[PDB]
PDB file of C-alpha atoms in Angstrom:
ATOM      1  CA  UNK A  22     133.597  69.790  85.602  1.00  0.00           C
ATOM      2  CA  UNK A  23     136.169  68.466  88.440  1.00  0.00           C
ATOM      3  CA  UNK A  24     136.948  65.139  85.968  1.00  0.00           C
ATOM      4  CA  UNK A  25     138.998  62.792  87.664  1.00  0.00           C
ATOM      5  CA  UNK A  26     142.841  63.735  87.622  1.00  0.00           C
ATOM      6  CA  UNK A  27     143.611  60.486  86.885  1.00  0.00           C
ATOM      7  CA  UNK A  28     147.301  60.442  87.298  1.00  0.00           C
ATOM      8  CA  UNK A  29     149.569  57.821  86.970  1.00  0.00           C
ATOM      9  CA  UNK A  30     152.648  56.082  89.200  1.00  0.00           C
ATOM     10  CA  UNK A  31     155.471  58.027  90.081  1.00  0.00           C
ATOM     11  CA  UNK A  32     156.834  56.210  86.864  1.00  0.00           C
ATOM     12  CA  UNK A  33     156.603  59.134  84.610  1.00  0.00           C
ATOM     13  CA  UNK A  34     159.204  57.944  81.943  1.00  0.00           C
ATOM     14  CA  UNK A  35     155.919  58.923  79.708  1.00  0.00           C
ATOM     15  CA  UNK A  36     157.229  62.734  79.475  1.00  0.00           C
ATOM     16  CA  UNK A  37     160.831  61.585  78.687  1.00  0.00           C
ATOM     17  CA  UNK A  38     159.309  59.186  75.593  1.00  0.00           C
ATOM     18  CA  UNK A  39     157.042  61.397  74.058  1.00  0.00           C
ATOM     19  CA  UNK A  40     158.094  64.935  74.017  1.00  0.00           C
ATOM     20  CA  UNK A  41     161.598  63.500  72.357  1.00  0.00           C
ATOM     21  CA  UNK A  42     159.306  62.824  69.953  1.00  0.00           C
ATOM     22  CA  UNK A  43     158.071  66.092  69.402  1.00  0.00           C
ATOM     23  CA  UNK A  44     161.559  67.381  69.368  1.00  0.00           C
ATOM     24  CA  UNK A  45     162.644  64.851  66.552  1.00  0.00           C
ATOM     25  CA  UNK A  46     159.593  66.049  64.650  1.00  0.00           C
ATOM     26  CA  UNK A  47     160.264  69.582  65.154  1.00  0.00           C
ATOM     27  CA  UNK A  48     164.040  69.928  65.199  1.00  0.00           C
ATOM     28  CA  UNK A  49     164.585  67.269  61.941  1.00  0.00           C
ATOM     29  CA  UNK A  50     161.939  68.619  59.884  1.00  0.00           C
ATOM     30  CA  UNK A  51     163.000  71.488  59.997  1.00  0.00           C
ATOM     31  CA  UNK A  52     165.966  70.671  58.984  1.00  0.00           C
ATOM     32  CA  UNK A  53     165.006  69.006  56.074  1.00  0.00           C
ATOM     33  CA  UNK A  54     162.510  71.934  54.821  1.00  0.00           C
ATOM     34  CA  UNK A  55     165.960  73.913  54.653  1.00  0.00           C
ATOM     35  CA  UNK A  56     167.804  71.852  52.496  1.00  0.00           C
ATOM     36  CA  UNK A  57     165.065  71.276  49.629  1.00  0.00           C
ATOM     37  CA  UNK A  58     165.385  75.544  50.020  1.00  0.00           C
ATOM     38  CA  UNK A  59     168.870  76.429  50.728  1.00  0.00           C
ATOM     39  CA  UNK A  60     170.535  73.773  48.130  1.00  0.00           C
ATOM     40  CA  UNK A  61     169.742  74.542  43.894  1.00  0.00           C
ATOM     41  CA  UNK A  62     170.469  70.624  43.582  1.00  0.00           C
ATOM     42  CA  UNK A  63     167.669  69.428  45.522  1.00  0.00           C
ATOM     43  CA  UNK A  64     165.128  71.427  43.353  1.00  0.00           C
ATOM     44  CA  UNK A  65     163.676  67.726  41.366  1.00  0.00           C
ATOM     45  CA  UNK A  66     160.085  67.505  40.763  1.00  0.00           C
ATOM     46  CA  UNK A  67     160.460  64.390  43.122  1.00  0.00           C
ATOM     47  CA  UNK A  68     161.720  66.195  46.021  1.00  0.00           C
ATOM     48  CA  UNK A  69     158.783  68.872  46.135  1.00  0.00           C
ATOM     49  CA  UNK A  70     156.132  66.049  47.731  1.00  0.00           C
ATOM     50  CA  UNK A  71     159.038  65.160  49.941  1.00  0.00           C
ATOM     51  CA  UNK A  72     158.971  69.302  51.416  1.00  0.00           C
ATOM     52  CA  UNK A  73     155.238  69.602  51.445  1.00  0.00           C
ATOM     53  CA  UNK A  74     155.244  66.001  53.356  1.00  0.00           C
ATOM     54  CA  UNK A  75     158.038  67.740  55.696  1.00  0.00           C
ATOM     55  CA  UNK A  76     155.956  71.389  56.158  1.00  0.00           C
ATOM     56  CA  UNK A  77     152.637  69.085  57.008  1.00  0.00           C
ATOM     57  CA  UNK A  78     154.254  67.017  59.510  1.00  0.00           C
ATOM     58  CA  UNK A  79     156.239  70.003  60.991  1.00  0.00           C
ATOM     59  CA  UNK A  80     152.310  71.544  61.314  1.00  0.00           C
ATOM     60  CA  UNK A  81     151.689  68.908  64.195  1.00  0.00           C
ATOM     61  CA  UNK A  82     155.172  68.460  65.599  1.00  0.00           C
ATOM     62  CA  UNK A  83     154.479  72.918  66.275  1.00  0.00           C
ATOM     63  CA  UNK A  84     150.634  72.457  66.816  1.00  0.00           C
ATOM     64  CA  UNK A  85     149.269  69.858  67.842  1.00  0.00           C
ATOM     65  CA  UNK A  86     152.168  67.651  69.570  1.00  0.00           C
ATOM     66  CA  UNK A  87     152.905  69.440  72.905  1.00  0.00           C
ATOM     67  CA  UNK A  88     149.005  69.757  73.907  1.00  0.00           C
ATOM     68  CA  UNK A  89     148.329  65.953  72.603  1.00  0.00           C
ATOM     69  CA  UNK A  90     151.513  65.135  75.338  1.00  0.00           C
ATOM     70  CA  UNK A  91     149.755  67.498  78.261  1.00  0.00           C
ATOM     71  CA  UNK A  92     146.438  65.662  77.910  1.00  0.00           C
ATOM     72  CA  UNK A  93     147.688  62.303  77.348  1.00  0.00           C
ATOM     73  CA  UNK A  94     149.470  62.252  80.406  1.00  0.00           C
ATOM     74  CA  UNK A  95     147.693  64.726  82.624  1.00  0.00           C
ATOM     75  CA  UNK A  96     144.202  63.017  81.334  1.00  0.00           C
ATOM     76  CA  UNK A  97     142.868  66.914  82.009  1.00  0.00           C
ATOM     77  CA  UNK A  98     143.014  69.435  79.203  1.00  0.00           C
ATOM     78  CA  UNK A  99     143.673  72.802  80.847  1.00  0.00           C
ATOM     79  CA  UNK A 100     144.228  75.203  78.218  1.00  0.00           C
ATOM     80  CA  UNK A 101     140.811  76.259  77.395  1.00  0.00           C
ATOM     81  CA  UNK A 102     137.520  75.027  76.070  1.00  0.00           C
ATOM     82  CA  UNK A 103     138.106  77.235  72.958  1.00  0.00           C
ATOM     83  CA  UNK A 104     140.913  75.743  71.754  1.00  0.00           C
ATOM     84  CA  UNK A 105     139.087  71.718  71.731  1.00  0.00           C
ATOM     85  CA  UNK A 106     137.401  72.711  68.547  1.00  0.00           C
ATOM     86  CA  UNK A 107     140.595  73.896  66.582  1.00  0.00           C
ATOM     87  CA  UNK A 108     143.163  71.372  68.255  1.00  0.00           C
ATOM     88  CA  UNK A 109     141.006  68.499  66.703  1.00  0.00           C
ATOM     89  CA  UNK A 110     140.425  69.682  63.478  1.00  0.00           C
ATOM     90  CA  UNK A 111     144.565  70.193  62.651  1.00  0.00           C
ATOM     91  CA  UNK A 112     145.625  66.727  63.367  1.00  0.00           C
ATOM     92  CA  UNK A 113     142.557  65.163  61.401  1.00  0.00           C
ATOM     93  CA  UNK A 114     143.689  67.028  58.201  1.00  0.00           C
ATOM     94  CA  UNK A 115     147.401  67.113  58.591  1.00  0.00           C
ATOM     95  CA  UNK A 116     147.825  63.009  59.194  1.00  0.00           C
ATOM     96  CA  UNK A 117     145.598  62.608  56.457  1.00  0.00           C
ATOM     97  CA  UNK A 118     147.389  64.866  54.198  1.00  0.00           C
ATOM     98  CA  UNK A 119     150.659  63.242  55.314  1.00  0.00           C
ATOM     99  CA  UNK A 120     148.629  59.555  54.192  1.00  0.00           C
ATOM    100  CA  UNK A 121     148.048  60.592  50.456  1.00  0.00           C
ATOM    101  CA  UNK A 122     151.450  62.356  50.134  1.00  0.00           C
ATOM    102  CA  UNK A 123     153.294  59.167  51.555  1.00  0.00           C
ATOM    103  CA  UNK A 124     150.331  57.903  48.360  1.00  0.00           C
ATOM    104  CA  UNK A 125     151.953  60.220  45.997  1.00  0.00           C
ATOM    105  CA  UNK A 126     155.364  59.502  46.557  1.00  0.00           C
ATOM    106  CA  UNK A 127     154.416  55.716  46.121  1.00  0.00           C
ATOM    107  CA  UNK A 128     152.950  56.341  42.867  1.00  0.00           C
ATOM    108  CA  UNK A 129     155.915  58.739  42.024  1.00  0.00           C
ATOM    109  CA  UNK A 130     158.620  55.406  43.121  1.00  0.00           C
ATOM    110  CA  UNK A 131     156.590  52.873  40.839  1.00  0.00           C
ATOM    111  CA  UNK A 132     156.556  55.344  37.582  1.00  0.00           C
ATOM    112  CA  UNK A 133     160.285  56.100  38.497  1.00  0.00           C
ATOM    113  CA  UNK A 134     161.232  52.047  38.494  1.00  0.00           C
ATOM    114  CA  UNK A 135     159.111  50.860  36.310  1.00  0.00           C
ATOM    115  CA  UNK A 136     159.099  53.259  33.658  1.00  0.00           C
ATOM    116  CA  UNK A 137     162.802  54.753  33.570  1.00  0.00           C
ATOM    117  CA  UNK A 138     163.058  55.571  30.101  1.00  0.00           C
ATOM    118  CA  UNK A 139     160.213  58.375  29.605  1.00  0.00           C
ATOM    119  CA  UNK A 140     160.279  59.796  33.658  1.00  0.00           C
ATOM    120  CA  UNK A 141     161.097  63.125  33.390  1.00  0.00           C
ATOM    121  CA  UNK A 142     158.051  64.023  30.558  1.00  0.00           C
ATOM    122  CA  UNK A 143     155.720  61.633  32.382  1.00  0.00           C
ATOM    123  CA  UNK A 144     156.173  63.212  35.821  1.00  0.00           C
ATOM    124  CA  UNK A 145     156.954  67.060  36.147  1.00  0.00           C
ATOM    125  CA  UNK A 146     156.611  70.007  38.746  1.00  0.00           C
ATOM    126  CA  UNK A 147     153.108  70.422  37.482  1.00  0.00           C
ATOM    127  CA  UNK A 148     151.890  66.611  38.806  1.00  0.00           C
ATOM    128  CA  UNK A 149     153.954  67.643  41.986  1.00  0.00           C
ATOM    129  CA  UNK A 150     152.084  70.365  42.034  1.00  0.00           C
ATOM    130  CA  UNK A 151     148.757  69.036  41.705  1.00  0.00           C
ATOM    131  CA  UNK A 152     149.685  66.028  44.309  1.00  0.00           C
ATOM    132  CA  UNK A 153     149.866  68.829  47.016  1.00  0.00           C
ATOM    133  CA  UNK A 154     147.072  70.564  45.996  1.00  0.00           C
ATOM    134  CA  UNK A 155     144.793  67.322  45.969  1.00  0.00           C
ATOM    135  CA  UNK A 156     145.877  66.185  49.428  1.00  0.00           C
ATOM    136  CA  UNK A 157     145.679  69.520  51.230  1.00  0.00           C
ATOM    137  CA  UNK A 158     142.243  70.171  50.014  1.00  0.00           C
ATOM    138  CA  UNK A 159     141.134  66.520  50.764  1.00  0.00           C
ATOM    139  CA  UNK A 160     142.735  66.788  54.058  1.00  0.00           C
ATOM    140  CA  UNK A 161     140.739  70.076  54.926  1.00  0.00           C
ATOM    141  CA  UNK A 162     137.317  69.351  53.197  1.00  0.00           C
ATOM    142  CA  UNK A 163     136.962  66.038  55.279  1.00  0.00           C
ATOM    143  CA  UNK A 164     138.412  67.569  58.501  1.00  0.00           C
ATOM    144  CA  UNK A 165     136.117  70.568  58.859  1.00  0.00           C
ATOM    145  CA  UNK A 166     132.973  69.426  57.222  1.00  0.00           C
ATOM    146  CA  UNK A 167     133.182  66.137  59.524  1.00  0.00           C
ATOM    147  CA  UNK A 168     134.202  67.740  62.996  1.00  0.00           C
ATOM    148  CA  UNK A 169     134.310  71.278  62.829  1.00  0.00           C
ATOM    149  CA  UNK A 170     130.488  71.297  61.881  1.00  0.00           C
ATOM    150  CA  UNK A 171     130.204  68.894  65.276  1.00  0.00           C
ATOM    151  CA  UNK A 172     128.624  66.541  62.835  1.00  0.00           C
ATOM    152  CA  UNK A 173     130.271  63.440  64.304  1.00  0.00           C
ATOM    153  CA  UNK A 174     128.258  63.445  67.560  1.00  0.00           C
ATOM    154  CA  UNK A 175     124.533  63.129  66.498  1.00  0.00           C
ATOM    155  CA  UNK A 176     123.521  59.978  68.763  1.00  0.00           C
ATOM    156  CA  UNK A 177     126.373  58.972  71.182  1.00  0.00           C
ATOM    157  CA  UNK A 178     126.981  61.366  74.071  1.00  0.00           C
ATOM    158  CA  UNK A 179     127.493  58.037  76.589  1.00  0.00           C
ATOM    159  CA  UNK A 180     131.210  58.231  77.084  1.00  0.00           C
ATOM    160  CA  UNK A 181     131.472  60.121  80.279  1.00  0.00           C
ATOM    161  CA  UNK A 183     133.801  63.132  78.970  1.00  0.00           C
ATOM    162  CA  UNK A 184     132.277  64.614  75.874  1.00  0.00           C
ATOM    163  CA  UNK A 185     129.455  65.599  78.178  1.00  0.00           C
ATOM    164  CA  UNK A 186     132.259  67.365  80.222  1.00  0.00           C
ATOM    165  CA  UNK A 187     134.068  70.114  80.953  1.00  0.00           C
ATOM    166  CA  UNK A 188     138.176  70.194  79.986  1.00  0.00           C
ATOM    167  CA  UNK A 189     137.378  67.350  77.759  1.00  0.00           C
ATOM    168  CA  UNK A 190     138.326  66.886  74.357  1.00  0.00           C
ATOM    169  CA  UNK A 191     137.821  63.909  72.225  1.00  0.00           C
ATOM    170  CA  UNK A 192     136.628  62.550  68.486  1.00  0.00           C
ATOM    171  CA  UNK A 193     133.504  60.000  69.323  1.00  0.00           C
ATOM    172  CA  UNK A 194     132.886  58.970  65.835  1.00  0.00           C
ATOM    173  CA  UNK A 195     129.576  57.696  65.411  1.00  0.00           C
ATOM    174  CA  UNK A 196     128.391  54.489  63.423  1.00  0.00           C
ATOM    175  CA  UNK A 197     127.373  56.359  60.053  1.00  0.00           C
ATOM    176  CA  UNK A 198     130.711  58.644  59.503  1.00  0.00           C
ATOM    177  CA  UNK A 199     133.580  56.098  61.262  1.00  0.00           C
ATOM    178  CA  UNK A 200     132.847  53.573  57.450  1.00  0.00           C
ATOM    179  CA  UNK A 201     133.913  57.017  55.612  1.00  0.00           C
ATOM    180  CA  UNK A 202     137.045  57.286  58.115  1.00  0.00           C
ATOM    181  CA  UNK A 203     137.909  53.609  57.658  1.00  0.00           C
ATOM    182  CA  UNK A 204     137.473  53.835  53.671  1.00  0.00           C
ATOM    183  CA  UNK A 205     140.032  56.885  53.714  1.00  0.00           C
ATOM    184  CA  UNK A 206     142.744  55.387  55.678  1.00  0.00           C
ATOM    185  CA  UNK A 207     141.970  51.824  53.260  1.00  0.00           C
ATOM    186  CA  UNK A 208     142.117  53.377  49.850  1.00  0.00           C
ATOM    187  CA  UNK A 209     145.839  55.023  50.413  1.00  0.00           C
ATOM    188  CA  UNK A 210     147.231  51.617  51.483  1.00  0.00           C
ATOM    189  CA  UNK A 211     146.142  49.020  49.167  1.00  0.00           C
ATOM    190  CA  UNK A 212     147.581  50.848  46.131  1.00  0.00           C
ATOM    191  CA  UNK A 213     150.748  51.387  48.035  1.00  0.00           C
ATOM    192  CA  UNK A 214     151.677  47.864  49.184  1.00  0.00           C
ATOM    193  CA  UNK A 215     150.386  46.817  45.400  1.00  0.00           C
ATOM    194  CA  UNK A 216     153.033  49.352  44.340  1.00  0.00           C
ATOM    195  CA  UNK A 217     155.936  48.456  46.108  1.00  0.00           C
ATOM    196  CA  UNK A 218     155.041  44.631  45.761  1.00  0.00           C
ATOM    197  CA  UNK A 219     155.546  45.308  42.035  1.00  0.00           C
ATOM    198  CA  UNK A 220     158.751  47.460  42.744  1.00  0.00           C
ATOM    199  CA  UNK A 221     160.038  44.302  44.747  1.00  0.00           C
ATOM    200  CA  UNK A 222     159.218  42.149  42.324  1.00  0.00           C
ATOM    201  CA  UNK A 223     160.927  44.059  39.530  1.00  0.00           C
ATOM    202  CA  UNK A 224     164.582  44.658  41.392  1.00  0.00           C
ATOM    203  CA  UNK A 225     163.915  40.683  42.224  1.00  0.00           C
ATOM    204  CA  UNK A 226     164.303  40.285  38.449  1.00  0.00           C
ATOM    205  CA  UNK A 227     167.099  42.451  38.445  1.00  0.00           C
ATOM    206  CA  UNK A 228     168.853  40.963  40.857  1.00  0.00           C
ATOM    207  CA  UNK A 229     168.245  37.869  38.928  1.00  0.00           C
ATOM    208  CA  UNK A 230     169.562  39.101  35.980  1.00  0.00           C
ATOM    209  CA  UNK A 231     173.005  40.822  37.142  1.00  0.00           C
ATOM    210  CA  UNK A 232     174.292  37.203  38.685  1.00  0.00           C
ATOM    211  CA  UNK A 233     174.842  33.971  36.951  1.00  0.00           C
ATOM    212  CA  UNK A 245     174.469  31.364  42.734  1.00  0.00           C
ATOM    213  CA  UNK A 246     171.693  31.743  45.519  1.00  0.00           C
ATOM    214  CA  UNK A 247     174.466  32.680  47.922  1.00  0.00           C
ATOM    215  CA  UNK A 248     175.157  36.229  45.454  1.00  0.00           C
ATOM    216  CA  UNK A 249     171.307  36.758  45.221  1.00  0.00           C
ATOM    217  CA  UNK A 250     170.468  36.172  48.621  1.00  0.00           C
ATOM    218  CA  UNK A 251     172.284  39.444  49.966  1.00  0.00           C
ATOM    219  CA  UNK A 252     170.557  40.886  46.869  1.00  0.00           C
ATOM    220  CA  UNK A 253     167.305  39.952  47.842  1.00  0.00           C
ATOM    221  CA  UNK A 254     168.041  40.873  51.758  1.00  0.00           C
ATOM    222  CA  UNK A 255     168.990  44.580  50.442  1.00  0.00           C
ATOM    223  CA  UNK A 256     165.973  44.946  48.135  1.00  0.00           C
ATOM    224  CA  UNK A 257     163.812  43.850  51.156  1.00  0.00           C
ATOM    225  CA  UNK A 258     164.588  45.369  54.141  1.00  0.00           C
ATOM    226  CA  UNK A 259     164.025  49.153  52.728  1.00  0.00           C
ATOM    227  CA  UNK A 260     160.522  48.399  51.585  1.00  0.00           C
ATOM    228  CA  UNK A 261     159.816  46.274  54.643  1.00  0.00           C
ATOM    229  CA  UNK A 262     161.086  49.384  57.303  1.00  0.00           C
ATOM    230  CA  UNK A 263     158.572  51.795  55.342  1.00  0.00           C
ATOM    231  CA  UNK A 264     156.038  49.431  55.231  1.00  0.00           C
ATOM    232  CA  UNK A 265     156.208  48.205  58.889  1.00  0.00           C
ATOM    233  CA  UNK A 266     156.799  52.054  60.088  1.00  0.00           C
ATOM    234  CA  UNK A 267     153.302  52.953  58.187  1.00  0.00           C
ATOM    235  CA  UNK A 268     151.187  49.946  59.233  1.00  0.00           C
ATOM    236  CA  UNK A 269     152.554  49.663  63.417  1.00  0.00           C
ATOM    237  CA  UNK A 270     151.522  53.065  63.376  1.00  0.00           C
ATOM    238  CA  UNK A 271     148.445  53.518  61.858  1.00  0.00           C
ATOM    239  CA  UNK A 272     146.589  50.344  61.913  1.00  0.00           C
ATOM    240  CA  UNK A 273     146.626  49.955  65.602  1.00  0.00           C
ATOM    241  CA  UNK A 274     143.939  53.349  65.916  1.00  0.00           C
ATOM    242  CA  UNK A 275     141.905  52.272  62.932  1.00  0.00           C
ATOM    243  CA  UNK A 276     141.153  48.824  64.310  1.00  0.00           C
ATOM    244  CA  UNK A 277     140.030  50.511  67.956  1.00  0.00           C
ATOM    245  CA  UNK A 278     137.822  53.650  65.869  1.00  0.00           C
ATOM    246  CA  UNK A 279     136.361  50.588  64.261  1.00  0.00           C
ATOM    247  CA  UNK A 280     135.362  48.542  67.018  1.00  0.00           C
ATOM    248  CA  UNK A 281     133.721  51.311  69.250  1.00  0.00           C
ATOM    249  CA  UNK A 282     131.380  52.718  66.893  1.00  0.00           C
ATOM    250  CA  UNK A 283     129.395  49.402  66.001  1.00  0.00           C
ATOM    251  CA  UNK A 284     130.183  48.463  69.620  1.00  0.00           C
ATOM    252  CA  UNK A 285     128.408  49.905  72.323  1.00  0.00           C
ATOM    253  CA  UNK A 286     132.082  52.566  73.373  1.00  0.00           C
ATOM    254  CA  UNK A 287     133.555  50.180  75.575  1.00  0.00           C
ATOM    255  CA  UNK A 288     137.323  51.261  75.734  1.00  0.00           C
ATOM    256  CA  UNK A 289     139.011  52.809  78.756  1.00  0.00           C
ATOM    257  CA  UNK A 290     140.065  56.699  78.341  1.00  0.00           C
ATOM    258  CA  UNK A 291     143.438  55.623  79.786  1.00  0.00           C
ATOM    259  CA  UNK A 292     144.013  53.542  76.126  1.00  0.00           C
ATOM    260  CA  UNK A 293     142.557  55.965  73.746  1.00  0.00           C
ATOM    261  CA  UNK A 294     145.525  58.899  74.363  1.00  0.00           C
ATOM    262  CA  UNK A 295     148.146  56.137  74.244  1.00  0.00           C
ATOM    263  CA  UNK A 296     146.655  54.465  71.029  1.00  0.00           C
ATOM    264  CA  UNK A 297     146.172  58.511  69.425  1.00  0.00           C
ATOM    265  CA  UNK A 298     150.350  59.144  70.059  1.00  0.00           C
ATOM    266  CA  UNK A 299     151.012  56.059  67.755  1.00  0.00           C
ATOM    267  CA  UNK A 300     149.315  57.738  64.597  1.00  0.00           C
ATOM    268  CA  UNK A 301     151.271  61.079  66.370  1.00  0.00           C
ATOM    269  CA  UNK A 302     154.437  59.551  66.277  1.00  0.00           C
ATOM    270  CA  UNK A 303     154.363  58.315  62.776  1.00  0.00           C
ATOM    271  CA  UNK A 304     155.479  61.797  62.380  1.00  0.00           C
ATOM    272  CA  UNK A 305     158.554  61.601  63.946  1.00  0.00           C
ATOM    273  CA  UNK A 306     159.268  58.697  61.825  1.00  0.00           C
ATOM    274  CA  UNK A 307     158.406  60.147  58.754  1.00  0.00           C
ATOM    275  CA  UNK A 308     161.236  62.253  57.868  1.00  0.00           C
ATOM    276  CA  UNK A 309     163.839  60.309  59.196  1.00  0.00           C
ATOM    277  CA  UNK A 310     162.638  57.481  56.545  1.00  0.00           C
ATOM    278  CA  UNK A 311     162.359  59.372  53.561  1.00  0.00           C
ATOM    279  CA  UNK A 312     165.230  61.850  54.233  1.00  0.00           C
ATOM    280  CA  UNK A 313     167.775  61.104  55.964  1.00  0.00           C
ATOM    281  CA  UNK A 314     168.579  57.349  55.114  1.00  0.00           C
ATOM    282  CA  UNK A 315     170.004  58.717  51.439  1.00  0.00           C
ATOM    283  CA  UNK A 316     173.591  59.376  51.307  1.00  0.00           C
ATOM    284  CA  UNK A 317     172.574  62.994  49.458  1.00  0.00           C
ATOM    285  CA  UNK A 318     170.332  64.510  52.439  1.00  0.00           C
ATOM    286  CA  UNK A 319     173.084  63.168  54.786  1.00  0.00           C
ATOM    287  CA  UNK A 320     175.830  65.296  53.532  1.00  0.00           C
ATOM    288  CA  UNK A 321     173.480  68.275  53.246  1.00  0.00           C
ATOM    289  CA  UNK A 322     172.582  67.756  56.679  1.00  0.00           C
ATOM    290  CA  UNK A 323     175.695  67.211  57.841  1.00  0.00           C
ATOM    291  CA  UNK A 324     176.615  70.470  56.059  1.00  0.00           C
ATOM    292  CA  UNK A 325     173.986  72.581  57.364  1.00  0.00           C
ATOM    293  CA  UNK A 326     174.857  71.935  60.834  1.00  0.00           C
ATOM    294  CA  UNK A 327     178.267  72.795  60.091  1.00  0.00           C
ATOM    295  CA  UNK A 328     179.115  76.402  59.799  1.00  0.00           C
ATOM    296  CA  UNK A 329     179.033  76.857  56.233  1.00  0.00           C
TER     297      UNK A 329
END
């Protein structure tokens, strides 16, 4: 439909800062689906959620990515007007899939701390099992029976480039974007309840193994910070789209097209942070790594 180009200043620093994420999401999840495989150590109940997590997000770093980059910077989708209604219905089940498995493995963290004694009967392959298979299908009943059917777009067609041709986007109207905002709330609150709790309990710990607020304080400072770096990696990244799907729908779609693909890549690139968080800051995955690039 000739749609404006669009393009941007010669500053195009864009390419260089978001297909490195696609390569980190790609190349080190990979890496990581081969070492839950290769290794007959890595084979816990615990570390199953951690591989599906690693296949789903390895989905849109080898989907959905490398597209997402094209039109975000290029602002004009040439690769067919096909491909618009499959392209939008993989990253609206896979990110939400990734949401209730990062849920799981909460849930999974809190039984493991809080209840140490009777873990292993409490928590088997089985409830690792049925995590996966709970997400997946939630992820792909929601997904296709919201935007595959096209029944997210029964009202607003006054964002000229739905109406368009090359354009690809996810308009959510005023009656479906409260069952969005619900999905992406109910995952969260139970997760920053959990690891408030887990905080709370190595607190008391920490309490208990000294005894002098200078010994406790580096305590405290160590039982923080890996919480916090989970917690601030989830919420930066997702909250920021929520907020904006939000605040359009009940608004009358004021927001600039130029916004929308920038805001999009921050739920993205929660997937390039993903692994790297639960993987690779344990000493255990790090030697595996390490060995795996190695020769043997």
């Amino acid at each position: 439909c000739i749609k404006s180009s669009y393009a941007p200043w010669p500053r195009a620093i864009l390419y260089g800062v978001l297909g490195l994420g696609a390569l980190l999401a790609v190349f080190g999840n990979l890496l990581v689906i081969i070492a839950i495989l290769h290794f007959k150590q890595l084979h816990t109940p615990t570390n199953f959620l951690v591989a599906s997590l690693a296949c789903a997000d390895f989905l849109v770093g080898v989907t959905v990515m490398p597209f997402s980059t094209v039109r975000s910077v290029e602002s004009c989708w040439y690769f067919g007007e096909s491909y618009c209604k499959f392209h939008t219905c993989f990253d609206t089940s896979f990110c939400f899939a990734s949401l209730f498995h990062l849920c799981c493995i909460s849930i999974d963290r809190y039984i493991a701390v809080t209840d140490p004694l009777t873990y292993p009967t409490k928590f088997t392959v089985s409830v690792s099992g049925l995590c996966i298979a709970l997400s997946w299908f939630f992820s792909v009943t929601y997904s296709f029976s919201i935007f595959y059917t096209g029944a997210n777009e029964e009202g607003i067609e006054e964002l000229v480039a739905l109406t368009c041709v090359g354009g690809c986007q996810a308009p959510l109207n005023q009656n479906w974007v409260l069952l969005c905002f619900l999905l992406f709330f109910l995952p969260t609150v139970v997760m920053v309840f959990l690891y408030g709790r887990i905080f709370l309990v190595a607190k008391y710990q920490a309490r208990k193994i000294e005894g002098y607020k200078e010994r406790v304080a580096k305590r405290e400072r160590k039982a923080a910070k890996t919480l916090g770096i989970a917690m601030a990696a989830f919420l930066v990244s997702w909250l920021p789209y929520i907020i904006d799907a939000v605040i359009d729908a009940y608004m009358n779609f004021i927001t600039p097209a130029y916004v929308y693909e920038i805001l999009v890549w921050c739920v993205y690139y929660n997937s390039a942070m993903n692994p790297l968080i639960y993987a690779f800051f344990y000493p255990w995955f790090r030697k595996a790594i390490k060995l795996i690039v190695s020769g043997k």
